[PDB]
Amino acid sequence: PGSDYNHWLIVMEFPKDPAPSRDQMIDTYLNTLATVLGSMEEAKKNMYAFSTTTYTGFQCTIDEETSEKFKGLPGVLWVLPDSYIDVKNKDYGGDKYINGEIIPSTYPTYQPKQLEHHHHHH
């Protein structure tokens, strides 16, 4: 549902100690994408959304083969296909990254389906 094997959510892990700032995390997302894509220019072009609160990860337009390259990388916890949270607006959720400019998300606390926790029904 918006999932087409060319939009990928990459969930990461950060130091606690000094808590990374929000800008540090954005930079780290782009750093990670840039190492796989081989260029910072192409990372800035292909990162379209991210969170630093609800989850600590980013979402990018890369193909399936490319997404596999993230699974070994230090700091990467999950590589999962992204999907719409709002079909009408083709909204993938999370804050939007548009060539450096950040658009805060419409539903910031909304948990994406890919990161659902299953709660045992006792």
Short mmCIF file of N, CA, C and O in Angstrom, two decimals:
data_model
loop_
_atom_site.label_atom_id
_atom_site.label_comp_id
_atom_site.label_asym_id
_atom_site.label_seq_id
_atom_site.Cartn_x
_atom_site.Cartn_y
_atom_site.Cartn_z
N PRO A 1 0.84 -1.22 0.00
CA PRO A 1 0.00 0.00 0.00
C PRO A 1 0.87 1.27 0.00
O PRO A 1 1.13 1.86 1.05
N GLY A 2 1.31 1.69 -1.19
CA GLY A 2 2.49 2.53 -1.32
C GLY A 2 3.79 1.75 -1.31
O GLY A 2 4.84 2.30 -1.66
N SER A 3 3.73 0.48 -0.92
CA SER A 3 4.90 -0.39 -0.90
C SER A 3 5.13 -0.95 -2.30
O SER A 3 4.25 -1.61 -2.86
N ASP A 4 6.30 -0.65 -2.86
CA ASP A 4 6.63 -1.05 -4.23
C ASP A 4 8.08 -1.53 -4.35
O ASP A 4 8.62 -1.51 -5.46
N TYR A 5 8.71 -1.91 -3.25
CA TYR A 5 10.09 -2.39 -3.23
C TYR A 5 11.10 -1.33 -3.63
O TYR A 5 12.29 -1.65 -3.83
N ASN A 6 10.68 -0.07 -3.76
CA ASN A 6 11.60 1.03 -4.04
C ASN A 6 11.50 2.16 -3.02
O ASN A 6 12.04 3.24 -3.25
N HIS A 7 10.81 1.92 -1.90
CA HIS A 7 10.78 2.84 -0.77
C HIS A 7 11.09 2.02 0.46
O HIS A 7 10.42 1.01 0.72
N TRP A 8 12.11 2.42 1.23
CA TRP A 8 12.63 1.60 2.31
C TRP A 8 12.80 2.41 3.58
O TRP A 8 13.40 3.49 3.56
N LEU A 9 12.30 1.86 4.67
CA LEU A 9 12.50 2.41 6.00
C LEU A 9 13.72 1.74 6.62
O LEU A 9 13.78 0.51 6.71
N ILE A 10 14.69 2.54 7.05
CA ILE A 10 15.91 2.02 7.64
C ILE A 10 15.97 2.51 9.08
O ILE A 10 16.08 3.72 9.32
N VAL A 11 15.87 1.59 10.04
CA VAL A 11 15.77 1.95 11.45
C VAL A 11 17.14 1.81 12.08
O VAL A 11 17.84 0.82 11.85
N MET A 12 17.54 2.80 12.87
CA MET A 12 18.88 2.80 13.41
C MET A 12 18.90 2.96 14.91
O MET A 12 17.89 3.20 15.56
N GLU A 13 20.11 2.88 15.43
CA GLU A 13 20.39 2.86 16.85
C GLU A 13 21.47 3.89 17.12
O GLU A 13 22.41 4.04 16.33
N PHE A 14 21.35 4.62 18.22
CA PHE A 14 22.24 5.72 18.51
C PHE A 14 22.81 5.60 19.92
O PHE A 14 22.21 4.97 20.79
N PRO A 15 23.96 6.22 20.16
CA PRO A 15 24.46 6.36 21.53
C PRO A 15 23.43 7.02 22.44
O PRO A 15 22.65 7.87 22.01
N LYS A 16 23.45 6.63 23.72
CA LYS A 16 22.60 7.27 24.73
C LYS A 16 23.35 8.44 25.35
O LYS A 16 22.98 9.61 25.15
N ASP A 17 24.42 8.13 26.10
CA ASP A 17 25.37 8.94 26.87
C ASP A 17 25.16 10.45 26.64
O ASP A 17 24.25 11.00 27.28
N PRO A 18 25.89 11.18 25.78
CA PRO A 18 25.26 12.39 25.26
C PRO A 18 24.25 11.98 24.21
O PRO A 18 24.58 11.29 23.24
N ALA A 19 22.99 12.34 24.45
CA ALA A 19 21.92 12.07 23.52
C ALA A 19 22.22 12.80 22.22
O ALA A 19 22.43 14.03 22.24
N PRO A 20 22.27 12.11 21.08
CA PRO A 20 22.48 12.81 19.81
C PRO A 20 21.40 13.86 19.60
O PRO A 20 20.22 13.62 19.86
N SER A 21 21.82 15.04 19.16
CA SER A 21 20.81 16.03 18.84
C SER A 21 19.98 15.57 17.64
O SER A 21 20.30 14.58 16.98
N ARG A 22 18.91 16.30 17.38
CA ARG A 22 18.09 16.00 16.22
C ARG A 22 18.87 16.20 14.92
O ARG A 22 18.77 15.40 13.99
N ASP A 23 19.69 17.26 14.85
CA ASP A 23 20.49 17.47 13.64
C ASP A 23 21.58 16.42 13.49
O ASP A 23 21.94 16.07 12.35
N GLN A 24 22.13 15.91 14.59
CA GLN A 24 23.11 14.84 14.48
C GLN A 24 22.47 13.60 13.86
O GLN A 24 23.11 12.88 13.07
N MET A 25 21.24 13.31 14.23
CA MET A 25 20.59 12.11 13.73
C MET A 25 20.27 12.25 12.26
O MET A 25 20.48 11.32 11.49
N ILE A 26 19.79 13.43 11.85
CA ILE A 26 19.54 13.65 10.43
C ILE A 26 20.82 13.46 9.63
O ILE A 26 20.84 12.74 8.63
N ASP A 27 21.91 14.11 10.08
CA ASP A 27 23.21 13.94 9.42
C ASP A 27 23.64 12.47 9.39
O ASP A 27 24.17 12.00 8.37
N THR A 28 23.44 11.74 10.49
CA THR A 28 23.81 10.33 10.50
C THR A 28 23.00 9.53 9.49
O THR A 28 23.54 8.64 8.83
N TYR A 29 21.70 9.83 9.35
CA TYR A 29 20.90 9.16 8.33
C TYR A 29 21.50 9.38 6.94
O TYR A 29 21.63 8.44 6.15
N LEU A 30 21.81 10.63 6.62
CA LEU A 30 22.39 10.94 5.32
C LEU A 30 23.78 10.32 5.18
O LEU A 30 24.14 9.83 4.10
N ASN A 31 24.58 10.35 6.24
CA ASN A 31 25.89 9.68 6.17
C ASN A 31 25.73 8.21 5.81
O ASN A 31 26.47 7.69 4.97
N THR A 32 24.78 7.53 6.46
CA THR A 32 24.61 6.10 6.24
C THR A 32 24.16 5.82 4.82
O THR A 32 24.69 4.93 4.14
N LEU A 33 23.16 6.58 4.35
CA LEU A 33 22.69 6.43 2.98
C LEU A 33 23.78 6.77 1.98
O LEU A 33 23.88 6.13 0.93
N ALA A 34 24.62 7.77 2.30
CA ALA A 34 25.67 8.18 1.37
C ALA A 34 26.73 7.10 1.22
O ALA A 34 27.24 6.90 0.12
N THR A 35 27.06 6.38 2.30
CA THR A 35 28.07 5.33 2.19
C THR A 35 27.59 4.19 1.31
O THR A 35 28.39 3.59 0.58
N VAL A 36 26.30 3.87 1.36
CA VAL A 36 25.79 2.81 0.50
C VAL A 36 25.67 3.28 -0.94
O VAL A 36 26.01 2.54 -1.87
N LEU A 37 25.15 4.49 -1.15
CA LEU A 37 24.95 5.03 -2.49
C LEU A 37 26.23 5.56 -3.10
O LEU A 37 26.25 5.84 -4.31
N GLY A 38 27.29 5.74 -2.32
CA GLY A 38 28.54 6.23 -2.84
C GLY A 38 28.62 7.73 -3.05
O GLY A 38 29.67 8.21 -3.50
N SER A 39 27.57 8.49 -2.74
CA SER A 39 27.65 9.94 -2.88
C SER A 39 26.65 10.62 -1.95
O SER A 39 25.52 10.14 -1.79
N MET A 40 27.08 11.73 -1.36
CA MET A 40 26.20 12.55 -0.51
C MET A 40 25.11 13.22 -1.34
O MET A 40 23.98 13.38 -0.88
N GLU A 41 25.47 13.63 -2.56
CA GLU A 41 24.49 14.21 -3.47
C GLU A 41 23.31 13.28 -3.68
O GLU A 41 22.15 13.70 -3.65
N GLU A 42 23.58 11.99 -3.93
CA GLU A 42 22.48 11.06 -4.21
C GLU A 42 21.71 10.71 -2.95
O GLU A 42 20.50 10.44 -3.01
N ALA A 43 22.37 10.73 -1.79
CA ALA A 43 21.64 10.54 -0.54
C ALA A 43 20.67 11.69 -0.28
O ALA A 43 19.52 11.47 0.12
N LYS A 44 21.12 12.93 -0.49
CA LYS A 44 20.24 14.07 -0.27
C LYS A 44 19.06 14.05 -1.21
O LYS A 44 17.97 14.53 -0.86
N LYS A 45 19.25 13.48 -2.40
CA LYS A 45 18.19 13.39 -3.40
C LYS A 45 17.17 12.29 -3.07
O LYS A 45 15.98 12.42 -3.40
N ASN A 46 17.60 11.23 -2.40
CA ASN A 46 16.75 10.06 -2.24
C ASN A 46 16.21 9.86 -0.84
O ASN A 46 15.37 8.98 -0.64
N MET A 47 16.63 10.66 0.13
CA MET A 47 16.00 10.59 1.44
C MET A 47 14.79 11.51 1.44
O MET A 47 14.92 12.71 1.21
N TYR A 48 13.59 10.95 1.65
CA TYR A 48 12.38 11.75 1.62
C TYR A 48 11.70 11.92 2.97
O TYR A 48 10.89 12.84 3.11
N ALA A 49 12.01 11.08 3.96
CA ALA A 49 11.35 11.21 5.26
C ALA A 49 12.20 10.54 6.34
O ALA A 49 13.15 9.82 6.04
N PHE A 50 11.87 10.83 7.60
CA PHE A 50 12.64 10.32 8.73
C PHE A 50 11.88 10.63 10.01
O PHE A 50 10.97 11.46 10.02
N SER A 51 12.31 10.00 11.10
CA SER A 51 11.87 10.41 12.42
C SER A 51 13.08 10.45 13.33
O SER A 51 14.06 9.73 13.12
N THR A 52 13.01 11.31 14.35
CA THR A 52 13.97 11.27 15.45
C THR A 52 13.27 11.07 16.77
O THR A 52 13.88 11.27 17.83
N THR A 53 11.98 10.71 16.76
CA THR A 53 11.26 10.55 18.00
C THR A 53 10.55 9.20 18.04
O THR A 53 11.02 8.27 18.70
N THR A 54 9.44 9.10 17.30
CA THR A 54 8.66 7.86 17.26
C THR A 54 9.54 6.67 16.92
O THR A 54 9.41 5.59 17.51
N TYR A 55 10.42 6.84 15.95
CA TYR A 55 11.45 5.87 15.65
C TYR A 55 12.69 6.67 15.28
O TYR A 55 12.60 7.86 15.01
N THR A 56 13.86 6.03 15.30
CA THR A 56 15.08 6.74 14.90
C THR A 56 15.55 6.11 13.60
O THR A 56 16.44 5.25 13.58
N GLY A 57 14.97 6.56 12.49
CA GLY A 57 15.35 6.01 11.20
C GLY A 57 14.92 6.92 10.08
O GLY A 57 14.31 7.97 10.29
N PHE A 58 15.23 6.50 8.85
CA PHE A 58 14.94 7.30 7.68
C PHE A 58 14.34 6.42 6.59
O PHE A 58 14.42 5.20 6.64
N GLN A 59 13.73 7.07 5.60
CA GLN A 59 13.04 6.41 4.51
C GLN A 59 13.57 6.95 3.20
O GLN A 59 13.73 8.17 3.06
N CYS A 60 13.86 6.07 2.24
CA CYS A 60 14.56 6.50 1.04
C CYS A 60 14.09 5.71 -0.17
O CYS A 60 13.58 4.60 -0.06
N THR A 61 14.26 6.32 -1.34
CA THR A 61 13.91 5.68 -2.61
C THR A 61 15.17 5.01 -3.14
O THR A 61 16.05 5.67 -3.69
N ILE A 62 15.29 3.71 -2.90
CA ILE A 62 16.39 2.90 -3.39
C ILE A 62 15.75 1.58 -3.81
O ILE A 62 14.63 1.26 -3.42
N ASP A 63 16.46 0.82 -4.63
CA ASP A 63 15.86 -0.44 -5.04
C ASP A 63 16.15 -1.53 -4.00
O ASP A 63 16.91 -1.33 -3.05
N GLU A 64 15.55 -2.70 -4.21
CA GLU A 64 15.68 -3.78 -3.23
C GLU A 64 17.13 -4.22 -3.07
O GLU A 64 17.61 -4.39 -1.94
N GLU A 65 17.84 -4.40 -4.18
CA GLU A 65 19.25 -4.79 -4.09
C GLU A 65 20.03 -3.82 -3.21
O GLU A 65 20.83 -4.24 -2.37
N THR A 66 19.78 -2.52 -3.38
CA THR A 66 20.49 -1.51 -2.60
C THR A 66 20.13 -1.59 -1.12
O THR A 66 21.00 -1.46 -0.25
N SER A 67 18.85 -1.82 -0.80
CA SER A 67 18.42 -1.92 0.59
C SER A 67 19.13 -3.04 1.34
O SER A 67 19.38 -2.91 2.55
N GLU A 68 19.43 -4.14 0.65
CA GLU A 68 20.15 -5.25 1.28
C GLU A 68 21.50 -4.82 1.82
O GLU A 68 21.96 -5.37 2.83
N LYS A 69 22.13 -3.85 1.18
CA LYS A 69 23.45 -3.40 1.59
C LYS A 69 23.45 -2.78 2.98
O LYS A 69 24.52 -2.63 3.58
N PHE A 70 22.29 -2.39 3.51
CA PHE A 70 22.23 -1.79 4.83
C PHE A 70 22.22 -2.79 5.97
O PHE A 70 22.50 -2.41 7.11
N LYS A 71 21.92 -4.07 5.70
CA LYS A 71 21.63 -5.01 6.79
C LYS A 71 22.87 -5.30 7.64
O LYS A 71 22.76 -5.54 8.84
N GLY A 72 24.05 -5.28 7.05
CA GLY A 72 25.22 -5.51 7.89
C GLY A 72 25.71 -4.29 8.66
O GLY A 72 26.45 -4.44 9.64
N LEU A 73 25.28 -3.09 8.27
CA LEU A 73 26.02 -1.89 8.64
C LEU A 73 25.85 -1.58 10.13
O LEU A 73 24.75 -1.73 10.67
N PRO A 74 26.91 -1.11 10.79
CA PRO A 74 26.79 -0.74 12.20
C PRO A 74 25.74 0.34 12.41
O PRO A 74 25.65 1.30 11.64
N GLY A 75 24.92 0.15 13.44
CA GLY A 75 23.86 1.07 13.77
C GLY A 75 22.52 0.74 13.14
O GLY A 75 21.50 1.23 13.62
N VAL A 76 22.49 -0.07 12.09
CA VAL A 76 21.25 -0.40 11.41
C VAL A 76 20.59 -1.58 12.10
O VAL A 76 21.20 -2.65 12.25
N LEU A 77 19.34 -1.40 12.55
CA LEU A 77 18.57 -2.45 13.20
C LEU A 77 17.58 -3.13 12.27
O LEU A 77 17.40 -4.35 12.35
N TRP A 78 16.90 -2.37 11.40
CA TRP A 78 15.88 -2.94 10.53
C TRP A 78 15.94 -2.28 9.17
O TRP A 78 16.18 -1.07 9.07
N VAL A 79 15.72 -3.07 8.14
CA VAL A 79 15.51 -2.58 6.78
C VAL A 79 14.17 -3.15 6.35
O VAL A 79 14.03 -4.37 6.17
N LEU A 80 13.18 -2.28 6.19
CA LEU A 80 11.79 -2.68 5.99
C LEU A 80 11.15 -1.86 4.88
O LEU A 80 11.48 -0.67 4.71
N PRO A 81 10.24 -2.45 4.10
CA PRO A 81 9.59 -1.68 3.03
C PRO A 81 8.66 -0.64 3.62
O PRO A 81 7.90 -0.92 4.54
N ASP A 82 8.75 0.58 3.09
CA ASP A 82 7.89 1.67 3.55
C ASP A 82 6.52 1.58 2.89
O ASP A 82 6.33 0.92 1.87
N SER A 83 5.54 2.25 3.51
CA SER A 83 4.18 2.24 2.99
C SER A 83 3.50 3.54 3.39
O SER A 83 3.95 4.26 4.29
N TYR A 84 2.39 3.83 2.71
CA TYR A 84 1.62 5.03 3.01
C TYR A 84 0.98 4.94 4.39
O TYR A 84 0.48 3.89 4.81
N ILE A 85 0.96 6.08 5.10
CA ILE A 85 0.02 6.26 6.20
C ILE A 85 -1.24 7.01 5.75
O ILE A 85 -2.17 7.17 6.55
N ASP A 86 -1.29 7.45 4.49
CA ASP A 86 -2.42 8.26 4.01
C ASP A 86 -2.44 8.13 2.48
O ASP A 86 -1.69 8.84 1.80
N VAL A 87 -3.31 7.25 1.97
CA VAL A 87 -3.34 6.96 0.54
C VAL A 87 -3.66 8.21 -0.27
O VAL A 87 -3.06 8.45 -1.32
N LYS A 88 -4.60 9.03 0.22
CA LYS A 88 -5.05 10.18 -0.57
C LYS A 88 -3.89 11.13 -0.87
O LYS A 88 -3.74 11.60 -2.00
N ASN A 89 -3.04 11.40 0.12
CA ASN A 89 -1.95 12.34 -0.03
C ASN A 89 -0.65 11.68 -0.46
O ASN A 89 0.37 12.37 -0.59
N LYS A 90 -0.66 10.36 -0.69
CA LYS A 90 0.56 9.58 -0.90
C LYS A 90 1.62 9.94 0.14
O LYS A 90 2.76 10.25 -0.18
N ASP A 91 1.21 9.93 1.41
CA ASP A 91 2.06 10.31 2.54
C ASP A 91 2.68 9.05 3.14
O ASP A 91 1.95 8.17 3.60
N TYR A 92 4.01 8.99 3.15
CA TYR A 92 4.68 7.85 3.76
C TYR A 92 4.87 8.01 5.26
O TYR A 92 5.31 7.05 5.91
N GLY A 93 4.56 9.17 5.82
CA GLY A 93 4.72 9.37 7.25
C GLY A 93 6.12 9.79 7.64
O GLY A 93 7.09 9.63 6.89
N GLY A 94 6.23 10.31 8.86
CA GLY A 94 7.48 10.88 9.34
C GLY A 94 7.66 12.30 8.85
O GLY A 94 6.95 12.78 7.97
N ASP A 95 8.62 13.00 9.45
CA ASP A 95 8.98 14.33 8.94
C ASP A 95 9.54 14.20 7.54
O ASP A 95 10.26 13.25 7.23
N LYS A 96 9.25 15.18 6.69
CA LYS A 96 9.73 15.12 5.32
C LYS A 96 11.05 15.86 5.18
O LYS A 96 11.27 16.90 5.82
N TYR A 97 11.95 15.30 4.36
CA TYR A 97 13.21 15.93 3.98
C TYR A 97 13.10 16.34 2.52
O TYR A 97 12.92 15.48 1.65
N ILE A 98 13.17 17.63 2.24
CA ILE A 98 13.06 18.14 0.88
C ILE A 98 14.28 19.03 0.65
O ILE A 98 14.27 20.22 0.95
N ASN A 99 15.35 18.42 0.14
CA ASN A 99 16.59 19.12 -0.21
C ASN A 99 17.11 19.98 0.94
O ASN A 99 17.40 21.17 0.76
N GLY A 100 17.22 19.38 2.12
CA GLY A 100 17.69 20.07 3.31
C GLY A 100 16.60 20.65 4.18
O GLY A 100 16.79 20.79 5.40
N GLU A 101 15.45 20.98 3.59
CA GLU A 101 14.36 21.62 4.30
C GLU A 101 13.49 20.55 4.94
O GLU A 101 13.16 19.54 4.30
N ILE A 102 13.09 20.77 6.19
CA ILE A 102 12.37 19.77 6.97
C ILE A 102 10.92 20.23 7.10
O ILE A 102 10.66 21.37 7.50
N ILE A 103 9.99 19.34 6.78
CA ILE A 103 8.57 19.58 7.02
C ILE A 103 8.09 18.64 8.11
O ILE A 103 7.90 17.45 7.85
N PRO A 104 7.87 19.12 9.34
CA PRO A 104 7.36 18.24 10.41
C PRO A 104 6.10 17.50 9.99
O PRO A 104 5.28 18.00 9.22
N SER A 105 5.94 16.29 10.52
CA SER A 105 4.92 15.37 10.07
C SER A 105 3.53 15.79 10.57
O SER A 105 3.37 16.50 11.57
N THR A 106 2.50 15.31 9.85
CA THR A 106 1.12 15.60 10.23
C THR A 106 0.71 14.85 11.50
O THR A 106 0.01 15.41 12.34
N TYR A 107 1.13 13.60 11.65
CA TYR A 107 0.83 12.79 12.84
C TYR A 107 2.16 12.33 13.43
O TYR A 107 2.61 11.21 13.17
N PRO A 108 2.80 13.15 14.27
CA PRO A 108 4.17 12.84 14.69
C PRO A 108 4.29 11.60 15.57
O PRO A 108 5.29 10.88 15.47
N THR A 109 3.29 11.31 16.40
CA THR A 109 3.35 10.18 17.33
C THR A 109 2.78 8.90 16.74
O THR A 109 2.72 7.88 17.44
N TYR A 110 2.38 8.92 15.46
CA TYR A 110 1.73 7.76 14.84
C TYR A 110 2.75 6.67 14.57
O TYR A 110 3.78 6.90 13.94
N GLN A 111 2.49 5.47 15.08
CA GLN A 111 3.40 4.36 14.89
C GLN A 111 3.19 3.76 13.51
O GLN A 111 2.07 3.35 13.19
N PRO A 112 4.20 3.71 12.66
CA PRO A 112 4.04 3.06 11.35
C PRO A 112 3.75 1.58 11.49
O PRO A 112 4.22 0.92 12.42
N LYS A 113 2.98 1.05 10.53
CA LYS A 113 2.62 -0.36 10.60
C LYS A 113 3.85 -1.25 10.66
O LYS A 113 3.85 -2.26 11.37
N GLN A 114 4.91 -0.88 9.94
CA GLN A 114 6.10 -1.71 9.92
C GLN A 114 6.74 -1.85 11.29
O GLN A 114 7.46 -2.82 11.52
N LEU A 115 6.51 -0.91 12.20
CA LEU A 115 7.13 -0.94 13.52
C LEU A 115 6.14 -1.27 14.63
O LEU A 115 6.44 -1.07 15.81
N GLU A 116 4.95 -1.78 14.27
CA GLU A 116 3.95 -2.26 15.22
C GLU A 116 4.55 -3.21 16.25
O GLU A 116 5.31 -4.11 15.90
N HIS A 117 4.14 -3.06 17.50
CA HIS A 117 4.40 -4.05 18.52
C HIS A 117 3.16 -4.92 18.67
O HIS A 117 2.04 -4.39 18.78
N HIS A 118 3.34 -6.23 18.64
CA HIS A 118 2.23 -7.13 18.90
C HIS A 118 2.03 -7.24 20.40
O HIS A 118 2.98 -7.54 21.14
N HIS A 119 0.81 -6.97 20.86
CA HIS A 119 0.49 -7.01 22.28
C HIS A 119 -0.30 -8.28 22.55
O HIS A 119 -1.32 -8.53 21.90
N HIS A 120 0.19 -9.11 23.49
CA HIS A 120 -0.46 -10.38 23.77
C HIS A 120 -1.82 -10.13 24.41
O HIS A 120 -1.94 -9.35 25.36
N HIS A 121 -2.84 -10.78 23.86
CA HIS A 121 -4.20 -10.67 24.38
C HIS A 121 -4.40 -11.82 25.37
O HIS A 121 -4.70 -12.94 24.98
N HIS A 122 -4.20 -11.52 26.66
CA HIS A 122 -4.44 -12.49 27.73
C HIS A 122 -5.92 -12.55 28.06
O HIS A 122 -6.32 -12.15 29.14
#
